[PDB]
Amino acid sequence: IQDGKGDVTITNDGATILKQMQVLHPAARMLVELSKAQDIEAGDGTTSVVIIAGSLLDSCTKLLQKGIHPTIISESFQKALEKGIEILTDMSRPVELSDRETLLNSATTSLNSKVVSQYSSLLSPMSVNAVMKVIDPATATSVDLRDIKIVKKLGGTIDDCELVEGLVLTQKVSNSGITRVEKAKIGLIQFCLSAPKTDMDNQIVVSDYAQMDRVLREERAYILNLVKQIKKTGCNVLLIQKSILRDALSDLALHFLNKMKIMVIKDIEREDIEFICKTIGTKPVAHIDQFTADMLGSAELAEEVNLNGSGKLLKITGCASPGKTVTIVVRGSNKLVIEEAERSIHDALCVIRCLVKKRALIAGGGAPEIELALRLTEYSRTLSGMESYCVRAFADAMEVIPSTLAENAGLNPISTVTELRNRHAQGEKTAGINVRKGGISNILEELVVQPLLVSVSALTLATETVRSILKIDDVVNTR
Amino acid sequence: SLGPNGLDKMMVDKDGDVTVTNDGATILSMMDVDHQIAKLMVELSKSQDDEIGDGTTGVVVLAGALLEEAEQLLDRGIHPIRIADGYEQAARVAIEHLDKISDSVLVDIKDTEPLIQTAKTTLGSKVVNSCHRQMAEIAVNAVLTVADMERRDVDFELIKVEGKVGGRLEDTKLIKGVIVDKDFSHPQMPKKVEDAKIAILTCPFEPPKPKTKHKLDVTSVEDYKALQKYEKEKFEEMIQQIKETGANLAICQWGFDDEANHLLLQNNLPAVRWVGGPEIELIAIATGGRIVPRFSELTAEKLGFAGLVQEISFGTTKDKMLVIEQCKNSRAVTIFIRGGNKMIIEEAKRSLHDALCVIRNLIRDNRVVYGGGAAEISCALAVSQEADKCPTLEQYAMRAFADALEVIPMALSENSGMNPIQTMTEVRARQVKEMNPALGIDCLHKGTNDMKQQHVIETLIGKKQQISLATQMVRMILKIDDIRKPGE
Amino acid sequence: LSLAPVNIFKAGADEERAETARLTSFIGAIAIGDLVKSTLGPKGMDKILLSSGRDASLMVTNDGATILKNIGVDNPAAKVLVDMSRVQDDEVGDGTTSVTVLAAELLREAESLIAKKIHPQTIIAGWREATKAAREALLSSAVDHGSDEVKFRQDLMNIAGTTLSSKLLTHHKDHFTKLAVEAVLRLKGSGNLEAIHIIKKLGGSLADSYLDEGFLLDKKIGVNQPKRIENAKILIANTGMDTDKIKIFGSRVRVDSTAKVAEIEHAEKEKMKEKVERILKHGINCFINRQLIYNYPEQLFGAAGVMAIEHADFAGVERLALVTGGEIASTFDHPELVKLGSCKLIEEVMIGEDKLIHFSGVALGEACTIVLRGATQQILDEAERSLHDALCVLAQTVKDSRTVYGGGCSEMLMAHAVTQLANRTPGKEAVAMESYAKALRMLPTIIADNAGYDSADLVAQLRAAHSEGNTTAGLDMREGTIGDMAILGITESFQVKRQVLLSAAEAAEVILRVDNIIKAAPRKRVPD
Amino acid sequence: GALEDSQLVAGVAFKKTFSYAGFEMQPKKYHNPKIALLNVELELKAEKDNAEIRVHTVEDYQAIVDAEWNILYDKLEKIHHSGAKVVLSKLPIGDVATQYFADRDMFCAGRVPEEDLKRTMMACGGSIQTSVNALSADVLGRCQVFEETQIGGERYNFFTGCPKAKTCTFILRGGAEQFMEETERSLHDAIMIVRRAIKND
Amino acid sequence: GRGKATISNDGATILKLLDVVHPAAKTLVDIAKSQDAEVGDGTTSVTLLA
Amino acid sequence: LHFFMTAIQELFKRISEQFTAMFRRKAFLHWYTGEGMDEMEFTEAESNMNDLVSEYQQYEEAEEEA
């Protein structure tokens, strides 16, 4: 997609394409907000929920020409949705969090659809490792993705991506010469080291030649006093917070700090203090009298790395008191590949999040979609009246996804669904489309699975949107 | 738009606004004209409302009908100055005749009823007729309260008219205090009090600050610690001075502080913040207190007295209003207009202003005449009878005056649905045969043409101005012969 | 041949006389009531509003008050019906669709009466005696309750399930009725509807909404401060912790040495320490402030184990003083004249992708929060808008507890009282009174017309049942037949139906009296 | 009004000027007042635009704030001791001075045009004072009646009753803006005819 | 040019309100102002006489 | 330090950028030197111009040992 400003983004996510487009029909501007909801809770299946919602609204064209009121279709669709949940729940299989083989198989299924399908024998294991290091597997009800920080760095290729069990800073140090410290004592500071400034408007008046030399002398003994308090605690690495109203580090304080073999790092934002305190375990210090040798966080190594010419980077590893945070460095050759590589990893984190909230696994590859299209067919024969036509319309619209998986792979869509449906009512119920073999086989032998929350959350949200479209009868333009 | 059966006009403002009104002054005001003579008629009606307040759509009808009758005289070879000379002689006969049939009854507090019947007729024309009995008791009761009886004047600054949309039209009531649109400073203050002594203040609650370019120098640490102590003792000194004098409620013109807000709450002493200028002097007159500019001047003899200070709440909105009533003898009252429409409130305000202005006129001059067209039929006979003894080419001008004077009865009959020439002829024939100058037009279909029984009352000075002012404008128009204007 | 040979007005100003002004005011008002009619009744449809200059804000709504506030009309007589509709929404919050349809049906019946050569003042005087005879027959039919708790609760459940009917919430009517009736009883008789905070956020179905037992706050805690504390003692304050107390005077420092500046700087840092120590004398562990808290006092609270919540506006501080039960405190000089809050557990919750501070276990609980979940952004906006109509009408029933049977029974009741009066008064007003009774009977007609039923047959059955004694008969929209209203449970509020008659009769009176429309020269807009 | 309602007064008459809070709390009819014609700003302001205050201690801070409130109250007391009842001033009168004169049954006015104060002087017999340090009996005015009536929706102040008056004032009552201008121009012709007719009989 | 009307019967103000640009005619407008400055009456009697 | 109308720093920055590029190639320089100027006169202009920028203050791959 190319923006009108001159920005080009190669994407594959269904939630990203619909955001970048600029549609003007009001009925299609509601489809963008549908896929946004699936990206928030489920985090995957954003493309599937638009196909389902776009196929149900189509099946409503023939029912209107037959003389069926739209209110009956709204109530009859809820009948086929409440039944569809009961067909998906008993199909699923419970799973535990002590089984790495299941999570590895579920972190590759939502990885092989992207441009990094070739590099999954490396990104899948580092995605499972990044989630088990944040939550407690004994009592886990939700995972915060804010505890995982993704860093994008140009240069190299994708297979150079790694997992850092520490703190990564994107800015170089201010002190020149000292770039390698072992067994460091990190310390966070929030006050500035410059000439004394009060909140009230102050000024110094000189009315004698002898007082000119005192201003310079007494100034120099004030900065020196604060630097000698820091070295008393035994500090090696310094982290200064950003300040805009007054200077945070003068050239005099930096001259003293280099002479005591201390690394100085300036310009730290006010939004990532918590992530720093959660990683190395550093008490923030906002006053000089509170700078005690207990306000400090230990570490093993704190040194800056130098790339092949793309910049410098800061790595602090081996924390004495590690938290529940982890960070990932993404490497790519182009600015377009890095963005797509980053979205692919964020998809493999939302699938692991879905497994901890609802420990249930359901076979993928078009297996569930054809199952709801078969139980609802015989279900509608038992009903009578005008509601028996709406359930049949619900079942037929569920065959679009099994038709799309076979059409994109260059197979016959008519013969595939006919063979798929026939084998689904005579035996096993885990048969799907095999894109590698080229036909239909047992889908569990391909080691492809997906969480149960994705298939359900992509159906509850789809039916609700259609029930609101059928309420609309007029469009009027306002100011 | 004349008489009880008239219809009103839609008006659209230049920008986007809509006004519905029946008053003659405002209709000619928001109408944008380009003719210069049309701008003279606009000023003719405006000079009537501010002088009396009633009759502003009656003057332009008479002046317009007075000019039309002179059109035939000019075509016969008659100098315009001769017409403008004969008109003034007729206006001296009609005015001298109007005092002869004028009746004065009485004006005081104990027997009020002729005053009610005077304001009933003026309200008869406007949209406020469903409840026009109630709105005729507010107008009369809110005038003798604020009016002096020795100097014979009315201060309209002492009467506040405030309308709030939403509710019902018959919920309008007269408040004998001051209602201000504000609320208490702290959300945890009591909404009502039963015995409050009002402490009117002008000065804010901040620490003092001189107007000249002060600068305070801090050259040590003890000077700094002596400044924090100075600030906190000044707040506590203020609350002690209010509580000592016995005050119960504080009223301030300027704002409070974060610290001076709790001290008022912690001491069980509610207060109101950021009140307006004109509203303060109405609370001082109503409650009987005095205004102090400092805290040092606050004594026990400078405090007001209220009987009830509540905080009324409207419907599902955040609009709170403070009301003050149950006071002793007062000189300030307010009118609270309600209604379910934006245009109802605005027209209700205009109709009430006309009712108040009618009673104000009766204080200056007690004597009244009877309306419904009775004054015009009687005045047109005196002019016509005297014109028979004036042989100097003035009988034509006098007869033309008495013919344009009868357009008022012919405008009420046409609006009512009756035939003008068939009803007007029968009224004069009955008035000459009898000796009853109080016969008019039965516009409301009640059966009797006797206006005295139907209680139709009009102020005398209202009718005098509609003749003396309308004649003089005709003299300008008849004097003007040349126009020089640029072309567009 | 033209409009008078002379030119009075300016260039661009227009005037309309009697025969054409009545044409504009009557086609302008009918157009307003025709767009809105489609959204009336249990089976009314829904509209879409697109803005052409407001960055294309797509909003989807049903109520007849937000539609009129958005449609840009230039008709002078159509602006009256848009203003009266706003006042209805700001008075009782329900009945905007019914007040515009009724006032638009009165005007339609007043155009065929002018064509019969009837003076407008005859219609108006005849309608005044019709409204008076209609409001007397509605007051006499009201059922006053409130002496029994088991009966008053059943009356509030019926009102709530009747308002939510035309709205999108009608799918889950059994679930949103309990959330709407329990949130009003938490106010304990106070009409402060602002105390209910409706928090809406994307994700989840409409059936995942709930009413929280305690409270929820969308704020954050300081760094390295305890996330949970059991058995808390909350202190609600409003004091300036920004930098320092500026101590407003015209003051400045005029020392002559740079060591004396360092001493004054240390004096500010010991001014804030003293202020913090005066707070801790209360014996608290949860400080809540309505302004910012800077980096110095943030560490002082975190060293004694105190939770500090910063940047909570007036909307979140006034509410927290009604939930826990504390007071908004300042000046911190007397710990014995202040009252602290109370809780039982404070934790951090995860609703979707955001963190909120949860208050489990409260003393008073006079305010609450409602969490709305939905698929699209337009469903969240419509659920909030519809839910606000259920809370507004239940705050009126508690102050004035008398209900009137709805669902078409009340409209036919007042229409019969006018008919018996119109058969008594001689003259032309008998014709004008029948038009008033004719306009009230089309409100039940529109409800049955949207559902596709035989409207002309159901009104005849209702009119025949209301003139023989059956005063509770009304429409039954679930089947299509005639059913009782005291059994099914269709109930309305007395104040809502009273404000519809009085508002729709005044607006039809103001418009009908107009006989001349005078337009000034429009203000031009500068193109460049 | 009407053309026959024009009056000639035997003193001065000027329109009501801007008034602050408390103006409606003071009497509007006097029997034998003493007019104090002034040219002073009786309002709380800075002593001189070119000024600066440099205080060192908080005890001297409070004495400065009390010094400005004592300068103003010194001027008002000097007026009240002189026996005056009506005060006029070209420069504005603040609200603090308005409420000072309301508690002592004394009338106040401000922002009077120069053409109206000079017409008062040759009607009452005072003098414009730029200072309040000298208010003797010979620098005050006197009359017989003073009131504030309403004419045509406007408030006017009257100073009738001056036996030694040497000025008059015409109040013209018409019905339009051009009715009064033509009446004023017509009156301007009889004024100059009589003025020329005294020097040449 | 703005729209303000000046209605009067006296020569002096009528001749002041006309934008006379003729050099010969501007003498008659200048003597009218002289008459209304010395005596104040007879302004339109010196215009017909001239 | 008495220049009025950023802090004027932008105006002097762009002028010396074009001037340095022009003086490096010594383009159109013979028009000024031929009538009585010299090379050192222009050097003092850019040296002084750099000083005023310094008064208007706003506020390599070998880093192993020192």
Ligand SMILES: Nc1ncnc2c1ncn2[C@@H]1O[C@H](COP(=O)(O)OP(=O)(O)O)[C@@H](O)[C@H]1O
């Ligand atoms: N009840 C009544 N019966 C007969 N004439 C009336 C009645 N009420 C008012 N009028 C007449 O209506 C005329 C016009 O008054 P109105 O329409 O109120 O406007 P305005 O008072 O501004 O002229 C008056 O001259 C009065 O005589």
Ligand SMILES: Nc1ncnc2c1ncn2[C@@H]1O[C@H](COP(=O)(O)OP(=O)(O)O)[C@@H](O)[C@H]1O
């Ligand atoms: N379940 C129901 N059965 C019959 N009538 C109903 C029902 N619910 C609502 N109504 C009727 O629908 C009418 C319109 O209600 P609605 O459109 O929801 O809001 P408004 O009153 O603002 O138009 C009401 O007068 C009510 O009597």
Ligand SMILES: Nc1ncnc2c1ncn2[C@@H]1O[C@H](COP(=O)(O)OP(=O)(O)O)[C@@H](O)[C@H]1O
């Ligand atoms: N009573 C009278 N009878 C006849 N002519 C008169 C009478 N009074 C004045 N005049 C004449 O009218 C003229 C007045 O002209 P006028 O319009 O006043 O001119 P101006 O305005 O320049 O003085 C005088 O020249 C005088 O001769």
Ligand SMILES: [Mg+2]
């Ligand atoms: Mg996927």
Ligand SMILES: [Mg+2]
């Ligand atoms: Mg009137």
Ligand SMILES: [Mg+2]
């Ligand atoms: Mg409703």
Ligand SMILES: [Mg+2]
């Ligand atoms: Mg003359």
